[PDB]
From a paper:
2-Oxoglutarate (2OG) [name] Fe(II)-dependent oxygenases couple substrate oxidation [name] 2OG decarboxylation to give succinate [name] CO2; they have important functions in human biology, e.g., in hypoxia signaling, extracellular matrix biosynthesis, lipid metabolism, [name] DNA/RNA damage repair. The human 2OG oxygenases studied, [name] [name] hypoxia-inducible transcription [name] [name]-α (FIH) [name] aspartate/asparagine-β-hydroxylase (AspH), catalyze C3 hydroxylations of Asp/Asn-residues. Like AspH, human [name] [name] the hypoxia-inducible transcription [name] [name]-α (FIH) catalyzes the post-translational oxidation of Asp- [name] Asn-residues in a 2OG-dependent manner, however, to give the β-threo hydroxylated product. FIH was initially identified as catalyzing hydroxylation of an Asn-residue in the C-terminal transactivation domain of [name]-α isoforms (Asn803 in [name]-1α), a reaction that suppresses [name]-mediated transcription.
FIH was crystallized in the presence of Zn(II) [name] the 2OG derivatives 11 or 18 to investigate their binding modes. FIH crystallized in the P41212 space group (FIH:11, 1.99 Å resolution; FIH:18, 1.90 Å resolution). Clear electron density corresponding to 18 or 11, respectively, was observed in the active site; 11 [name] 18 bind FIH in a similar manner as 2OG. The analysis of the electron density maps for the 2OG derivatives indicates that only (S)-11 [name] (S)-18 bind FIH, even though both were present as racemic mixtures. The conformation of (S)-18 in the FIH:18 structure is reminiscent of the NOFD conformation in the reported FIH:NOFD52 structure, indicating that these molecules inhibit FIH by a similar mechanism: their bulky phenyl substituents extent into the FIH substrate-binding pocket [name] appear to shield the active site metal from the substrate [name]/or O2. In agreement [name] the proposal that the coordination of (S)-11 [name] (S)-18 to the FIH active site impairs substrate binding, FIH crystals [name] both inhibitor [name] substrate-bound could not be obtained. To investigate the mechanism by which the synthetic 2OG derivatives inhibit FIH, the concentration-dependent effect of the potent FIH inhibitor 18 on the 2OG Kmapp-value was investigated using [name]-1α788–822. The 2OG Kmapp-value decreases in a linear fashion [name] ascending inhibitor concentrations, while the vmaxapp-values converge, indicating a linear 2OG-competitive inhibition mechanism. Using non-linear regression, the Ki-value of 18 was determined to be ~0.2 μM. Notably, 19 inhibits FIH more than one order of magnitude less efficiently than the structurally related, but conformationally more rigid, NOFD (note that NOFD was used in the enantiopure form, while 19 was used as a racemic mixture). However, the potency of 19 was increased when replacing its C4 benzyl- [name] a 3-phenylpropyl-substituent (IC50 ~0.9 μM; Table 3, entry 11).
Residue numbers in the entry:
A (entry chain A), B (entry chain A): 15 to 349
Write the structure that this text describes.
Amino acid sequence: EPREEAGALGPAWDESQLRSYSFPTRPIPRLSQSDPRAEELIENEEPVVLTDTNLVYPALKWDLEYLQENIGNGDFSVYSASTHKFLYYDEKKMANFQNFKPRSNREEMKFHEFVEKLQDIQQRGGEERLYLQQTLNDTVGRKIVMDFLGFNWNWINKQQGKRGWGQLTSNLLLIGMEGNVTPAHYDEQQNFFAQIKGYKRCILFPPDQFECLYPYPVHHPCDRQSQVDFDNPDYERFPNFQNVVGYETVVGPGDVLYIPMYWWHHIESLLNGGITITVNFWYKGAPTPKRIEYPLKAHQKVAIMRNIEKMLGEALGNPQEVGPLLNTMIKGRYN
Amino acid sequence: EPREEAGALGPAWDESQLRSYSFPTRPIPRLSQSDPRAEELIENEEPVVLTDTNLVYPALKWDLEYLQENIGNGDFSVYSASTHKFLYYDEKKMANFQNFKPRSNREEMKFHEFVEKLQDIQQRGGEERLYLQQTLNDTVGRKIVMDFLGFNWNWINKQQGKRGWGQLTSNLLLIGMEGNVTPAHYDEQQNFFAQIKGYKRCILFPPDQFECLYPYPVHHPCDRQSQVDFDNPDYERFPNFQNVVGYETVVGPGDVLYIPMYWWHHIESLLNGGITITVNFWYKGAPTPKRIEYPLKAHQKVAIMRNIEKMLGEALGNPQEVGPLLNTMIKGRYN
Ligand SMILES: O=C(O)C(=O)C[C@H](CCCc1ccccc1)C(=O)O
Ligand SMILES: O=C(O)C(=O)C[C@H](CCCc1ccccc1)C(=O)O
Ligand SMILES: [Zn+2]
Ligand SMILES: [Zn+2]
C-alpha cells in the first residue's frame, strides 16, 4: 500500500496511478540498510528496497532546470515512441533480423534540446513520449561531478566487496515522462537502482519464471526482453504467462532497489506522476566458482541456455538456422 | 530385382523373402570395383554395392562346420530374442535409464555352444531367435588367421588411404538366422560391409532424413537407433516417418556394401534364406578440416546436435534433465 509523505503531505501516490495487469504480485520488502534481513536478501540474490542508504543523496535536488545548467554539453540518447512502451532493442543485432523495425526512435541530442522538445510536447498537448537513457560520462559539468562524487561510495563499495562482484560497469541516467513503461526484461549484471525524482512501480520475476516470460531469441535485437505484451497477453502463444507471479514495489526519491542479476523486471513511471529520474549502478556478477555445486540455480540454467543458442549460431554460421535445428533435435525425441 | 545365379541355378532370392514396409525405396547402384562411378560414389559418401572386390574371398568357404573347427575357443557374444528384431542397446548407458529393459538377452558362449543351441532350436521347431555378433580378435585359430590374412587388404587399404580415413577400428563377425532384423540405426564410423553367406536386404537412409527417423536421446542405451517401429509406425508420435525414402539392395556372397558414416541402415536376413554370415570393416572418418566450408553437410548438423546433447547432460549433471531444458529453450521462442 502507499507510503505517507512526512509533514502530513498526504500519500505520495495512490493505486489509481498503477497500470492494470493479469497476474498477481506480493510486495518486495522495504528495509533499512542496517537491517540484517536486508543484508541476507542481497546475499541470497533476492530483491529488497533499501530506504536509507543515502546512495544518491546529492542528486535528490536534481530537476530539469538544474541538470540543463550543469550536466554539460555532451550528447544524450533520447528515445521517442507513439506508445507508452519503450521496448529495448540492441542495434548491434538488427543485422541478424532485417525484418525487425523498432517502435522507439533514438535521437542523439543536447540536454537543452531534450528539455525543449519536452516543453513543445507539453505546450501543444501532444501524445508523443520521450525517454532519456544515457550513461554518465566525463562530459558532465563540474557541479554534476561534485554531486556524483558525493554519492555514498562507502556503502556501495562495501556491498560490491562483500558480494564478490566485479567492477562498477556504468551508471545509467534515466529521465522519463509519466506513464512511460520499460517492458519486462532481465539484465546480466547486478543492479542497484537509485530513485531520485518521482515514483516508479517495479515488478520483478525470479529467474525460475523463464518459462512463463518467453524471451526473444538470443540473436534477436530484443534478446533478454519478454515477448509477451503485458497489456494484451497472447495466451495461445504464451500459455505459461498464466502462471506468472511478480514481486512489486513503488520506489520514490531516496529509495534504492536491488535488482539481482537475471531477475526479470518491468518498470513503469506512475501515471500522472510527473517526470521521473533514476540512476542505476551496474556491477558484473561474482565469478563462477571453480567447483560447481549441484543443484544448479535457476540463473545458471538460463546461462546455459544462452550459451547453447550462441554456440549453435556460431557453429551453423547463421542465427536464423538456430530455431530449425533445435526443433529438429527435440521433436519426437524430447517432447 | 533379383539377380540370377551362375550356372542357370535360378534366382538366388525372390521378392516373397522381403518384409513389407510403409515407405518407398530406389535401388543402390551395384558396380565393379574398377568402375569410376563407384569411386566417385565413395568419394562423395554415397552408398554403393561393389560386386568384385574379393575383399573376403577366403571367407566365402565359411560355414558353421568350418568355423566351429577353426575359430578357436574364445567367447562369442550371442543375442537371443522372442522377436525378429534385434534392437542394439549400449549396456554402458543403461544406468542413465534404469527403466529400460532390453528385449534381446546377451549370452557369452563358446562357438560350439552357439552351434548346439541353434541345433536344439531347429530340432524342437522353436521360435527363439539367435544372432551372434562378435569382434574378431587374437583368439581365433590358425586357419581363420590364414583366411583373415588373405582378405584383399591391398584394395581396402587404398580406399582408406584415398579417403583420408583413420585406422581400421574392428571387424565384426555377424551370424544370424533367416528373418533376423537389425532395426534402423546409424553408426559414426565408415563401413565396408562384406557379405559371406546367405542374403541380407539393406535399406539405407541419408543423414538428411534425421527428422523422419527419430533417434533415441544420446544418453539412452538406444542412442543412434530409430525409435520408429518399422512394422507398426506410430504416425502420431513420428509424423515425418511418412516422408521417409530409402535406398535398397540385397547383398549376397561376394558383395561389399559401402555404408557411409551417419547413414541410417536397416538390415534384414532374407526370410527362409538360411543362416547369414557377414563381416564388417569399420574405419574412423577423416578428420574434420581446419577451415569449415559452409554450407554444412547433413552429417555435420547431426554431429552438432549430438554434441549439444552431450554437453547439456554434462553441464546439468543429469541426462534426465536434458529434455526439460531443451523444451524450456524452444517453447514459445523457436517454435
Ligand atoms: O536500471 C534498469 O536496469 C532498468 O531496467 C531501468 C529501466 C530502463 C532500462 C532500459 C534498458 C533496457 C534493457 C537493456 C538496457 C537498458 C527503466 O527505469 O525504465
Ligand atoms: O555392420 C553394421 O554396421 C550393421 O549394422 C550390421 C548389422 C548388425 C549391427 C549390430 C549393431 C547395431 C548398432 C551398433 C553396433 C552394432 C546386421 O548386419 O545385422
Ligand atoms: Zn533492466
Ligand atoms: Zn550399423
